[PDB]
Design a binder for this molecule. Structure first.
Ligand code: NAG
Ligand code: NAG
Ligand code: NAG
Lengths: 27, 25, 88, 48, 31
């Protein structure tokens, strides 16, 4: 989780990002 | 006679009044 | 000037519509706007009194309608995606 | 058995290092995450 | 002021890659 990588930066125009059903805690 | 020389990197200037950060633009 | 509250605005002919808040974004003395990776106006500085206001889109969100099949109930539970529960 | 355990215990270890000292193991994952985001920005810029 | 070097360039339509910094000051550029 460190070796991999703003979220709302591309959310300016209706481009939303629905959260995944499974949460990185469940996974 | 004009004596040339090597500009190196000088001569950059804020092209606008916009602010940015950490952003190669 | 109003804060923390969705407003239309114009600053100095810069317009847009947002939620103007208080922001530590240290703007440059001659710098007017801010901007952002996506090239979308972000911070501004109040022309009269010089200070760094954020901006922020309004809300969006979808509206999802949770339902047990109408065969069971008529009762639905709306879900407003991706907002903080006020603007409802 | 003893030997194998060590071989295996050791073997685990290197992974940490393979992962710690290198950003190029996860390229795949790391990529997907780009291409998406990569493709958003494009989508956005189109607004302008 | 007559009883000291100076220079002249000329600007050209180059395209640069700036790099702003956190404070917002251009800390580098690439032609
Ligand atoms: C759902 O209700 C319908 C009538 O609206 C009925 O035909 C059906 O049997 C019901 N479903 C179940 C699982 O009982
Ligand atoms: C939600 O809104 C309240 C204001 O009623 C605010 O105090 C809180 O920080 C917000 N939290 C989130 C997660 O949006
Ligand atoms: C911005 O300026 C402040 C002034 O002290 C300094 O602390 C900070 O490191 C600077 N950051 C950058 C990116 O210039």
């Amino acid at each position: 989780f460190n070796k991999v990588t703003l979220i709302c930066a591309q959310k300016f125009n209706g481009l939303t990002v629905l959260p995944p059903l499974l949460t990185d805690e469940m996974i | 006679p004009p004596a040339y020389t090597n500009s190196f990197t000088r001569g950059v200037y804020y092209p606008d009044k916009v602010f940015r950060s950490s952003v190669l633009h | 000037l109003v804060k923390n509250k969705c407003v239309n605005f114009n600053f100095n002919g810069l317009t847009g519509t947002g939620v103007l808040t208080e922001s530590n974004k240290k703007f440059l003395p001659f710098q007017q706007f801010g901007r952002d990776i996506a090239d979308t106006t972000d911070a501004v500085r109040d022309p009269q009194t010089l200070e760094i206001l954020d901006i922020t889109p309004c809300s969006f969100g979808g509206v999802s309608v949770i339902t047990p099949g109408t065969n069971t109930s008529n009762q639905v539970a709306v879900l407003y995606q991706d907002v903080n529960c006020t603007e409802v | 058995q003893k030997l194998i355990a060590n071989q295996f215990n050791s073997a685990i270890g290197k992974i940490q290092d393979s992962l710690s000292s290198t950003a190029s193991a996860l390229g795949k994952l790391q990529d997907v995450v780009n291409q998406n985001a990569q493709a958003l920005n494009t989508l956005v810029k189109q607004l302008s | 002021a007559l009883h000291a070097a100076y220079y002249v360039g000329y600007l050209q339509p180059r395209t640069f890659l700036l790099k702003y910094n956190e404070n917002g000051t251009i800390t580098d550029a690439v032609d």
